[PDB]
Amino acid sequence: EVQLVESGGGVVQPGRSLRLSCAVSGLRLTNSGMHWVRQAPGKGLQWVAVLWSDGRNTDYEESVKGRFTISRDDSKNTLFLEMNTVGAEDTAMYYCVTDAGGSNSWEFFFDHWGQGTMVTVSSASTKGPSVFPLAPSSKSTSGGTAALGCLVKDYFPEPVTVSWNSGALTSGVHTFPAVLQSSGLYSLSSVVTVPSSSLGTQTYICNVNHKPSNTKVDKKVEP
Amino acid sequence: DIQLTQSPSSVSASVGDRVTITCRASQGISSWLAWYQQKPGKAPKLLIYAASSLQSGVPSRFSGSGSGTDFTLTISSLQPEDFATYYCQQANSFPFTFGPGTKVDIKRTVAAPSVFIFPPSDEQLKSGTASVVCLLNNFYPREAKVQWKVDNALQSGNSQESVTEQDSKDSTYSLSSTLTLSKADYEKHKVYACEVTHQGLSSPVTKSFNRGEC
Amino acid sequence: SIQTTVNTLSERISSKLEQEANASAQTKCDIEIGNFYIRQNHGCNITVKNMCSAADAQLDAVLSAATETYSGLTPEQKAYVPAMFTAALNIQTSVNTVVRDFENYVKQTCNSSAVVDNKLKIQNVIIDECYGAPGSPTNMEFINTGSSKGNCAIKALMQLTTKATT
Numbered sequence: 311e312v313q314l315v316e317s318g319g320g321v322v323q324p325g326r327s328l329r330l331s332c333a334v335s336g337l338r339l340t341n342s343g344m345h346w347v348r349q350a351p352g353k354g355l356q357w358v359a360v361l362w363s364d365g366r367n368t369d370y371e372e373s374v375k376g377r378f379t380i381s382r383d384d385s386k387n388t389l390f391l392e393m394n395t396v397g398a399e400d401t402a403m404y405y406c407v408t409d410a411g412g413s414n415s416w417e418f419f420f421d422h423w424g425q426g427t428m429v430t431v432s433s434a435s436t437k438g439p440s441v442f443p444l445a446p447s448s449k450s451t452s453g454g455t456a457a458l459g460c461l462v463k464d465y466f467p468e469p470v471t472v473s474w475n476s477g478a479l480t481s482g483v484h485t486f487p488a489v490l491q492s493s494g495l496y497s498l499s500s501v502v503t504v505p506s507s508s509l510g511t512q513t514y515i516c517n518v519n520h521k522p523s524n525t526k527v528d529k530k531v532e533p
Numbered sequence: 534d535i536q537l538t539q540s541p542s543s544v545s546a547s548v549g550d551r552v553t554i555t556c557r558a559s560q561g562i563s564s565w566l567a568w569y570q571q572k573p574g575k576a577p578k579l580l581i582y583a584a585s586s587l588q589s590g591v592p593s594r595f596s597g598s599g600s601g602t603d604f605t606l607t608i609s610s611l612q613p614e615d616f617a618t619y620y621c622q623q624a625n626s627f628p629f630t631f632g633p634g635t636k637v638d639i640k641r642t643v644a645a646p647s648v649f650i651f652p653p654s655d656e657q658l659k660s661g662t663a664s665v666v667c668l669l670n671n672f673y674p675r676e677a678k679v680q681w682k683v684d685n686a687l688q689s690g691n692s693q694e695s696v697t698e699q700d701s702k703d704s705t706y707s708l709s710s711t712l713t714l715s716k717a718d719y720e721k722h723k724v725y726a727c728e729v730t731h732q733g734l735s736s737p738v739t740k741s742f743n744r745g746e747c
Numbered sequence: 748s749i750q751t752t753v754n755t756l757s758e759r760i761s762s763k764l765e766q767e768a769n770a771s772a773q774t775k776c777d778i779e780i781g782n783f784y785i786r787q788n789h790g791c792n793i794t795v796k797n798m799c800s801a802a803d804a805q806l807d808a809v810l811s812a813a814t815e816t817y818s819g820l821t822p823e824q825k826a827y828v829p830a831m832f833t834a835a836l837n838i839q840t841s842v843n844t845v846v847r848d849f850e851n852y853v854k855q856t857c858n859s860s861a862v863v864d865n866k867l868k869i870q871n872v873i874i875d876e877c878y879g880a881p882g883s884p885t886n887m888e889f890i891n892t893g894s895s896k897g898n899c900a901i902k903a904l905m906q907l908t909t910k911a912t913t
Binding site: 347354355356357369371372405410417418419420421423424425426440442443444445447449450451452457459461463484485486487488489491497498499501503 | 565567569575576577578579582588620622624625627628629630631632633634647649650651652653654656657660664666668670693694695696697707708709711713740742
Binding site for chain 1: 781782784785786787788789871873
């Protein structure tokens with residue numbers, strides 16, 4: 311079967327450069343047109359660029375023309391996207407794909423897709439989150455159940471993992487997708503509903519792990 | 534460029550439902566149109582090419598039709614594994630463009646959000662900022678509207694919102710909305726309120742608190 | 748088969764681009780052809796050649812060599828041209844109306860905003876289909892008049908050419 315395996319993704323500063331690679335097994339590039347397709351977080355798919363079977367002719371979406379270069383190394387059957395003048399608009403999951411057409415045809419639809427490689431373009435420096443209680447109260451309680459949680463604010467970059475009581479609490483936990491604030495830092499919340507009675511019998515602690523900063527915070531959330 | 538629009542923007546179905554999604558192109562593109570399926574966290578996968586040709590391996594319950602500007606993708610009997618977002622794509626001319634997507638979710642009985650609000654912590658305020666958080670918990674369907682109001686003024690441009698994925702156990706959704714304001718500006722208003730509109734609710738519900746309330 | 752006509756076509760196109768449009772391979776090309784996409788190539792080597800100038804004579808010039816080239820065709824050959832008008836351009840036409848219908852097709856199609864008012868000095872071409880003789884590959888040339896307008900007529904003429912090889 312055709313396997314496409316991307317690498318090269320990461321965090322990168324605006325204006326600087328990066329190279330994505332797509333290793334291809336099951337098919338020779340000399341026998342296939344190839345493309346890159348990107349997907350910004352939360353958005354749709356956008357076509358980026360196409361390399362011909364001959365390894366040399368190319369075309370680009372207008373927005374990236376001049377800044378990106380699509381090429382390959384036959385010796386290694388590997389496709390590449392060279393991104394040179396990255397702006398924060400280039401933040402996206404980058405998917406390497408095959409044109410269904412071969413050395414004598416074009417189809418312009420994409421029958422094989424790689425697993426994806428994420429490029430985040432930002433001016434932020436790495437930063438651990440600071441973790442704020444979402445305290446249970448009368449405003450967060452309905453009959454038996456109280457809701458409570460943690461606001462995980464101002465961290466960079468994704469991701470953060472969150473558990474409750476070292477993973478002993480799993481039922482009724484909702485840990486939401488992060489949002490990207492106008493500050494350039496992410497923020498997210500993790501909430502849990504528990505029996506309102508347990509508020510004096512069980513302490514609740516959210517365990518926040520931010521590997522890029524080597525940060526682990528255990529925040530006790532009290533009434 | 535060729536604009537592709539898709540209808541409905543979302544759709545909810547039970548296992549076994551017939552489901553049909555539409556794609557309309559801003560210009561004629563003959564049969565140069567494909568459909569892809571995508572699931573959370575995963576690469577798109579091709580289902581249909583040349584408008585009506587099923588990609589090999591794809592289950593037989595998928596089909597497409599049309600030519601010109603208007604196209605259809607039908608799932609004759611939706612299966613648990615078909616719950617995903619679907620994109621159409623034109624192959625007529627550069628740049629190759631995609632439609633915006635059409636999410637297909639698991640139908641469930643309507644369930645109104647449990648609405649809760651959380652004032653900013655003292656620890657946060659010490660740092661000079663205030664985050665007020667409104668939680669809509671365990672509701673169905675996904676369509677929901679949160680409006681922040683400060684001193685009964687509708688408060689736009691200063692909140693952000695995240696929704697979980699559909700729950701695997703009970704097929705419900707939850708939603709976190711955060712209002713962020715200067716601590717300085719937080720102390721110049723009295724009443725903070727989250728107003729929630731949802732089909733499960735007879736009338737919009739409001740949860741609020743006063744700054745300086747225990 | 749079709750090769751002669753294409754070459755003969757191409758030559759009159761360049762011969763008349765010089766004699767009338769006053770162009771030269773050495774002339775600066777305002778617009779240049781970027782890539783030539785054939786969706787199904789089964790024997791065609793298509794090369795681009797620059798005879799750039801400065802458009803209505805380009806258009807008027809390309810019309811001349813087409814008309815003259817169609818006229819040269821044997822009447823029993825020329826009967827094939829209407830079928831390829833329908834297939835390549837979705838134009839309804841007949842032997843006696845070829846020259847007029849094509850004329851107005853290019854006049855109407857190529858004098859449209861989309862053409863004159865387009866901001867790309869490197870323009871691509873997409874062709875559905877092209878066949879070549881087993882052992883004998885159809886070899887064709889895309890004369891870059893140098894303007895959107897002129898290239899439109901070149902394109903229309905190329906869509907008819909490639910359509911013929913079916």
